[PDB]
Design a binder for this molecule. Structure first.
Ligand SMILES: *C(=O)C[C@@H]1O[C@@H](C)[C@@H](O)[C@@H](O)[C@@H]1O
Ligand SMILES: [Ca+2]
Ligand SMILES: [Ca+2]
Ligand SMILES: [Ca+2]
Length: 114
């Protein structure tokens, strides 16, 4: 199944933050309605924040997270969770190798903001 794709409410500001846990340099691209809106890159085996940014979901609300390492797409896992019918997390893990820890880049999207 497709992973890393989320439909947010339209025209909503959201946070996106990426952490790294891999010897490979992670590149995280965040697309809004299929256009790149943010790109983070970095390397850590200790959960360092490689980027954090506030974006806008636009008219469609479609947000996609893509992760690659040296140009090769990582395998993604994702889900969205809503607490008290208000607080939203869109969660992504990614795997660049064979150990299947799925933490090589971890991406968290949260809304609402403010
Ligand atoms: C390459 O070494 C594999 C890569 O980096 C490791 C340190 C570990 O985080 C592994 O999960 C990751 O796929
Ligand atoms: Ca891994
Ligand atoms: Ca890892
Ligand atoms: Ca508040």
């Amino acid at each position: 199944a497709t992973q890393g794709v989320f439909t947010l409410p339209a025209n909503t500001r959201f946070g996106v933050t990426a952490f790294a846990n891999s010897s490979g340099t992670q590149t995280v691209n965040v697309l809004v309605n299929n256009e790149t809106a943010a790109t983070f890159s970095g390397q850590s085996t200790n959960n360092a924040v490689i980027g954090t940014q506030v974006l806008n979901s636009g008219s469609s609300g479609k947000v996609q997270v893509q992760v690659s390492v040296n140009g090769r797409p990582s395998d993604l896992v994702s889900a969205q969770v809503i607490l008290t019918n208000e607080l939203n997390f869109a969660l992504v893990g990614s795997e660049d190798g064979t150990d299947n820890d799925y933490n090589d880049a971890v991406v968290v999207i949260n809304w609402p903001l403010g």
